[PDB]
Amino acid sequence: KEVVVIVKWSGKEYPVDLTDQDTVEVLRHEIFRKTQVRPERQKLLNLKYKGKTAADNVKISALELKFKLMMVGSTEDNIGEVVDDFDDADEESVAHSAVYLAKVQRRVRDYKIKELAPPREGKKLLVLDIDYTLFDHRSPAETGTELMRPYLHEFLTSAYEDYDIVIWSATSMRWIEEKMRLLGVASNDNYKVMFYLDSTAMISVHVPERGVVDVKPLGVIWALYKQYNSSNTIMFDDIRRNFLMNPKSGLKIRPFRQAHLNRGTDTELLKLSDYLRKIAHHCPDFNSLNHRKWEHYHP
Ligand SMILES: [Mg+2]
């Protein structure tokens, strides 16, 4: 079951953890997770299946034994994501399969959370994406103030009244730390962020009809911090795919693009602060909500 593939890239070795039932496609996604080289940019030099380049659908099981996999490829400020053109808006699931649960458990076992501030009794949990969620990561700008989504700090202060806050970005931890300083979130007098999660906490899951997708599994947090669960957790992300393994707990935020043109009109965070306050005060079980209809929630 448990398998380790050693990948050699750019003069370094990267031990990749997976199982023998994972496919080459999953391997590519785990390689991306380790190296920041995208799956489509990876040339896997010495991975043959019956004398030929193993296809993405080949299970790891069906081949080798100690071995070092040579990968040639490049990783690009073109960081993060801007859209998912294959977003399925139909209102599941492998989100309840053994394979998925085991993937969460491995993150729970191996990923080391660095607590920046402690949980507070009775609070809900808010998880926040960064790119296009809290700021415009695609525009050039001389200051962070210019790229910041309007009402960011007022939104975080309001949320913090009722929610402990976690930041989860599909990027390196370094990028997160840098942007949180740039945006003034890192050290604010009016709120605290509990911890940050990065792309290494994410998992790659095959979703039939769709292929392998990388998601942000709230189950990792829920396993480690048992005071939170789906009944009191909500996540904001502009990319719906990120909550494919916990669809009821995600709210797809409108992306904040081209700050220079839209900074004067964007008020999504103001509106969403109202939403968060209302559900924290009026909804004892968030699973009863339809977040797609958040703008019409008036208890
Ligand atoms: Mg984003």
Curated annotation (Swiss-Prot):
What Gene3D superfamilies does the record point to? HAD superfamily/HAD-like, Phosphatidylinositol 3-kinase Catalytic Subunit, Chain A, domain 1
GO molecular function, one example?
metal ion binding
- This protein's major location comes to nucleus
Outline the extent of the Ubiquitin-like domain. Answer: 3-72
Keyword Iron-sulfur attributed? no
Please list the residue ranges annotated as the FCP1 homology domain.
119-279
Identify one Gene Ontology CC term for this UniProt entry: nucleus
What is the protein name for this chain? Ubiquitin-like domain-containing CTD phosphatase 1
Organism, by scientific name, is: Drosophila melanogaster
